[PDB]
Amino acid sequence: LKLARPAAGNIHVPYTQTPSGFKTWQKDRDSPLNAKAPFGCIIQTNPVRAMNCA
Amino acid sequence: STANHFNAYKLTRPYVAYCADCGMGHSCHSPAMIENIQADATDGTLKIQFASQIGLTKTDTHDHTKIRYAEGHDIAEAARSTLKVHSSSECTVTGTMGHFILAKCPPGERISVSFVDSKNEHRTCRIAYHHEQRLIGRERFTVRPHHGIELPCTTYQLTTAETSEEIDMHMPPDIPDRTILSQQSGNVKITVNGRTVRYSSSCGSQAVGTTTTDKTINSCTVDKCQAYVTSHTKWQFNSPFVPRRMQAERKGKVHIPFPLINTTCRVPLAPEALVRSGKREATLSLHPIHPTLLSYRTFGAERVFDEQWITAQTEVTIPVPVEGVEYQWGNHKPQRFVVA
Amino acid sequence: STANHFNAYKLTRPYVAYCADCGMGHSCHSPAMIENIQADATDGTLKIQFASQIGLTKTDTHDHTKIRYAEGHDIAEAARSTLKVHSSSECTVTGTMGHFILAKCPPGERISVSFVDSKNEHRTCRIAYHHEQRLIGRERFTVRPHHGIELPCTTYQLTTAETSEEIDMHMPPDIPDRTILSQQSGNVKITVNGRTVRYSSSCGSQAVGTTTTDKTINSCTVDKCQAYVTSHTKWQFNSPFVPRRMQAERKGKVHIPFPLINTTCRVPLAPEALVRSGKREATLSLHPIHPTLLSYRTFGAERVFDEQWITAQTEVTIPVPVEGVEYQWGNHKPQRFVVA
Amino acid sequence: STANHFNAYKLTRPYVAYCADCGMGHSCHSPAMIENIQADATDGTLKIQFASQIGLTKTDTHDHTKIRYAEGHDIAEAARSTLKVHSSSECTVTGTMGHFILAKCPPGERISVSFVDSKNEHRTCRIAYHHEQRLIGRERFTVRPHHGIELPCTTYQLTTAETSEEIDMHMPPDIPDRTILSQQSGNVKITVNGRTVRYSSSCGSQAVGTTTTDKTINSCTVDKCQAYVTSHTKWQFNSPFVPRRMQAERKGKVHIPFPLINTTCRVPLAPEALVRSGKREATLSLHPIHPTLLSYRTFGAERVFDEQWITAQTEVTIPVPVEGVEYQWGNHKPQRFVVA
């Protein structure tokens, strides 16, 4: 977050932030490790357990 | 008032502020300036902060025909049909409780809201908001009507509730205006007005005095005048543009409409695949759909895992390992295969 | 009958449809469930199947003011001009013959129909079927006005008529109707409704009976009676939702209007080129137009033939061999070249 | 005359003209054929020549409701609200003086004007105009309302005023249609009209001469008669489509509305960067914004200087030479320096 000296007369309080890293790390998140797991076990996570772990 | 939400609506004087986007070229006092389009939902429910109080009448009439809007005075009226929300086209409005308007619209880079109900020709703004249709699923189409699949996805709870998470409306502010005063040859005069007017002259006894009534300050000029915005019976919404002319942030909290819940979605399934058998390898003939990210990964040791957004009719060389790889042709079943 | 085609439509009266595409989230009885959106024509006039009558009067009079709608009791009317077809914008309608509506729409992924006669604000369905702009020619632009081309393309000839291929209006739909019967504690009273309702109580005499009027049923309880409505003046659209409640389809005809004819469309011809000749090689400077396919084939024996959908003003070197190439640069005539 | 500019319209009585683009399938003497599209502005506003005088009253008065439509009886009304400019969607109207109608619109390849002001239901024609999104700035975002930037850009200054470029008005035309002649049962009995009914028949009384009365040249057939219409108090725009029925070229000048001038545009500068400089080289992590052309020129002697219209959250390996580089990344100033 970084605020700036805004446009006078109006109350424009410009405050420049970074990109949304949770959104930018969720959307644009990488290959989901549930797929492409070696040994062919289906990693299912109610509790994170690799059911059918071959 | 919560179910009929008009009590908590009428606690806050609904009013508009100077928005920078005003009809392709201006930055003017938007009576329907969008606060912020907040939408955490897989169902694609854009939820903007409504500039007026769309739903609460001039007397806090909780009636769909009345949408509380802005004027010089607090009383601004609009029709319930007079709202337009266009992303790349006018998306259907899903709900509107006072300061919170919510609905689904098509894809686009900017959302534009407009209301002409007392307003001349749809007074509104068009703020940039990249509406992305990035839904879940192996495929990538937006049509519920196929009878193929369901999947769990988020959706804004289309019912109205009393409150789940309230925005604090508080501190009826001042204005930046002086038209409440009028200098008659020495007399700064304040009449009945629609903005609260602290008389604050350039020199004289006009340092105090409310602005809904008459006051005279003789032997002064218009430049020797002084205005101020007094307040009564309201609380400003968030002060996003909002010249913070309240002494301390202390007002009610109006419940945020549309509390989202996890719902289902009609997941479109694709035409599955054609397994052309072979020697240590197979071919997967795929026809296109609304495009689908088909992924086939090896099943065994540290394995080849390919996944491409298939968007045509093509043939994918699925390597047929000794243990066999696990293929998924988009949003179908995850069925792997051994060497047939 | 056929000239006023609404008489032939009124032989098997217009119906409704419980389509799962029901207004961006719903699925219910629309009058405009998109039964079949078929338009195989280079002119781009999609024909959609609408469950009502497009122009058939309630009295079976060819009156363009009325659009045939539906009710529980089948007689539904709407404003025949008030209906709209929004594909990616409001696609321009061409005509309405009974259950067929034919119109040209913009490039888009799906099309929706919206009609509100008693309907609350244009009751609409939205099918997804990617209406692409696949027209033939050297260029790729949709603009008639410059005198540039005349190539034969197929399009639905928009004349009305009696029939070229009739949709079978048959299988008068044996309809359930059980909300119209109410058990007052010993009497299931089934009043007059939109058809003769056969009503089957679980025990006792309630099995059958004309229920286009009232009939009491002894021992009327809420679990007892099940309702159905059997009438006439009806043949099925397709049974697209349509449970086959007729015993066998008795397929009368409805002549699908707007037959296809091979017409000639005006194609755009772009500025042709500049040709710079070198030793056995030629450089065609193409100024760009709306994106156009330039094809240079070396005229003679087994020789290189390249064709590129060029989309920017550049220079392609068509090699001009001793046999000479033939270089058709876009939708102009095939100007060949000899070595010189 | 000019203060109300409709008097400068009223010097040459305007009317719709022959455009072969006349409603997606036909052509005609359209009332609102696009005479020419002129958009030379970095402000992103199109300007078009309209078939009516948008602003002239039915008597050529300054009429905010009045856009003077065309008929055979040329004095045609048009409602000031009925004009719709759908380029790729309903673009924002900006101004209308005479035939000069200017406004903003989205991206697109064509533009359609629709109005039905004497006629019922919206006569609309659509021509081609590849309306690109060619905006200036290091970034690429088309939304004014950020507090980010101000840069010089041309735009059509919308002051209604007299003239900087006066379109011509001369030659009240004749054409290949004069159907005001009649057949009086053995003669060419032509009806009289408001102007010179030039009875150019094959012979008899009909050979020449304007008809202020119903010119009945006896002993004439329909083919033996030929129509003619000569009028006055008018001036053709350019005769662009315009069958040029001017006997001699000489016009008056009507000033093109909205003279362009240099204004300022607001460009949004995105999140600047993360810098990680190492031995002889650095890395600049840019999160994505609206797409921004980041430029890295090697600050020193004749050196490598590259650019990239970056559109992701990626890390450009800023080559940090011993002389240094020049980091020009978007709307920010060229922040470049030597080794860190």
Swiss-Prot record, chains B, C, D:
Where are the Extracellular topological domains? 1-340
Region Interaction with host Mxra8 receptor, as annotated, extends over 26-29, 62-64, 184-187, 216-222
Question: What does the PTM comment state?
Answer: Palmitoylated via thioester bonds. These palmitoylations may induce disruption of the C-terminus transmembrane. This would result in the reorientation of E2 C-terminus from lumenal to cytoplasmic side. N-glycosylated.
- Point out the glycosylated residues in this chain: N262
Q: Where in the cell is it found?
A: Virion membrane; Host cell membrane
Q: List the disulfide bonds.
A: C19-C125, C22-C28, C91-C105, C153-C265, C203-C220
Protein's membrane topology: Single-pass type I membrane protein
> What happens on changing T179N?
Increased viral replication in insect cells and enhanced transmission after escaping the midgut of the insect vector. No effect on the binding to the host receptor MXRA8
Its quaternary organisation is: Interacts with spike glycoprotein E1. Processing of the precursor of protein E3/E2 into E2 and E3 results in a heterodimer of the spike glycoproteins E2 and E1. Spike at virion surface are constituted of a trimer of E2-E1 heterodimers. Interacts with 6K protein. Interacts with host MXRA8; this interaction mediates virus entry.
| Chain's role | Plays a role in viral attachment to target host cell, by binding to the cell receptor MXRA8. Synthesized as a p62 precursor which is processed by furin at the cell membrane just before virion budding, giving rise to E2-E1 heterodimer. The p62-E1 heterodimer is stable, whereas E2-E1 is unstable and dissociate at low pH. p62 is processed at the last step, presumably to avoid E1 fusion activation before its final export to cell surface.
This one is known as: Spike glycoprotein E2
Q: Which residues of the full protein are shown?
A: 325 to 664 of 1242
